[PDB]
Design a protein around this ligand. Structure first.
Ligand SMILES: [Ca+2]
Length: 223
């Protein structure tokens, strides 16, 4: 997260860190046994880390649970990043509490101008590299589809939306991928891609979760 602020320990209780020896992506807890992340985050050997603030210090509210199954969306397109969404089932049910909590899925899509909360442990520099230990947060509005397509000609699909600031300076970044965009208490986005981070006229691009609710529910019900 570039241009954001320190969330505060466990203030984003649905935020997860995916760990394969180190933090490599974010995710969102949607029930006690399932996490949503980005398909491009897929790898083997995932441990889901819930209840994290400082990812380099055990502070006493963490739950570390290995993945039992990963399911990349059947239509994930690694060329275009269309359908950049994955589900991860936990080997055991997390214990839900005030610091480890699920985020509701949307029942309808969100509209341009709605303010959302974007969070993660990704890079905090738009030029250079600095990775934080504690969770960072950014409030950012959804941009119109027209503005998104204007910023990224020929690259925006019906399963993507932009959020952020055309002036630059505030954005998600590498290491935030797979993490949440939450608007009015619903998970509307997954950190997916962009051109650089926090650059002028290059807002963040996010997977449009509202298009996947039926697939998420049916996949969870059958697995
Ligand atoms: Ca920790």
């Amino acid at each position: 997260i570039v241009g954001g602020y320190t969330c505060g320990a466990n203030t984003v209780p649905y935020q997860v860190s995916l760990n394969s020896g180190y933090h490599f992506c974010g995710g969102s807890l949607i029930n006690s046994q399932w996490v949503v992340s980005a398909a491009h985050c897929y790898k083997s050997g995932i441990q889901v880390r819930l209840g994290e603030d400082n990812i380099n210090v055990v502070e006493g509210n963490e739950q570390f649970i290995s993945a039992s199954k990963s399911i990349v969306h059947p239509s994930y397109n690694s060329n275009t990043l269309n359908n950049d969404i994955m589900l991860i089932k936990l080997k055991s049910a997390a214990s839900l509490n005030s610091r480890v909590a699920s985020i509701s899925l949307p029942t309808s899509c969100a509209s341009a101008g709605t303010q959302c909360l974007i969070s993660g442990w990704g890079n905090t520099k738009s030029s250079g590299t600095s990775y934080p230990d504690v969770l960072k947060c950014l409030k950012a509005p959804i941009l119109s589809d027209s503005s998104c397509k204007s910023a990224y000609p020929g690259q925006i699909t019906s399963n993507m939306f932009c959020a952020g600031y055309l002036e630059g300076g505030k954005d998600s970044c590498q290491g935030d991928s797979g993490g949440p965009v939450v608007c009015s208490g619903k998970l509307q986005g997954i950190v997916s891609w962009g051109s650089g981070c926090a650059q002028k006229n290059k807002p963040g691009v996010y997977t449009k979760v509202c298009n996947y609710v039926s697939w998420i529910k049916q996949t969870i019900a059958s697995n």
